[PDB]
Amino acid sequence: LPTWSLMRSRLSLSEVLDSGDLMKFAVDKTGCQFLEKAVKGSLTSYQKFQLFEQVIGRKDDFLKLSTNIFGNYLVQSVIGISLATNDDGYTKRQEKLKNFISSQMTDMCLDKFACRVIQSSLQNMDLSLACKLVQALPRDARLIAICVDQNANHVIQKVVAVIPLKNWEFIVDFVATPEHLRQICSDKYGCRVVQTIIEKLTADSMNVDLTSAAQNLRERALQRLMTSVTNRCQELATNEYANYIIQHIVSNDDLAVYRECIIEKCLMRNLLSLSQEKFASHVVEKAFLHAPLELLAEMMDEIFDGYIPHPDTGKDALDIMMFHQFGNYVVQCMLTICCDAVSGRRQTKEGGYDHAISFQDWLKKLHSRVTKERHRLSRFSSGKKMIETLANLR
């Protein structure tokens, strides 16, 4: 801090602006604190002119402040003041701001503090100029590093949230690339990007405001990404992060058409194996909970009769899953579903059939097995829950 301002004083904002020492105030813990409160008062036309010039008018100072732990707050304040100042410099300032950020898009996205200037600009700038910010995103392997970056991943999620799909449709096709999808979906942060994109591409209640032409664009982009996801749902469903994406698709009612595809492509004929996986067992749970009835019948038949019992012990698939540290949650799901059906909490009509007689069949199977194994089951918390679930039915 300059000595003419000394520790602290009764400083005026015009003093700071006229001194030429704003930069050493904006990077200071106490100085930037004074500026954040000063710019919230009634500024004169010239004081705003000075802030525009000194905070978002010089590229190098704008970059330095945007990447500063404290100065990035001042930049967002001044950007907001500039957007709220409808004078004759309004067009010139927003254009200069877009060019500043676009020229350093990638590095600002990867910066812990500058990525907040990006997100603030994306949601507050006029929609037209914010769209030009998306055009500055990279199209090579730096986009992968952005999607999997601890900071830059929120920039992509912000783009998806506040910018029309026409401007970021290339990200959908970039992520849908099979090689890119593997890296991104298997990342702690890249999996959030992919799930946020899917949610924005879903025709749910948050998208009824779209025009028909925008719905068609949304539908086509969704089909291209769902094709890529379902082409590889086996490695995604077992992955420690990508299993959340497969769960979301299987459990979302507005994505019901992709339920049959996912359940049939990677879940069917693998239920015993996937139910014993730490991550895939959650996907199996969701698949039982939301499967169409005709497909649910096939999943039930696979557990009850899809496997040959062990040739030495006679242990079958239900026995293995029932007492497995992960499979027991799947069997519990099967039992809760059947009890919900026979008691009325779940409807049983589909495709002209009433599957109530089928739910009664599967419940009879699980009740019969829980009865025989009541002593082994009573050792476990999961087993006591299955016994209690059945007793609550009567």
Binding site: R269, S273, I308, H310, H324, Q325
Partner: peptide, 15 residues
Amino acid sequence: QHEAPKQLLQLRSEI
């Protein structure tokens, strides 16, 4: 990954 080994069973044939 301190889990018990998977217990796999032979699948019934599909048609």
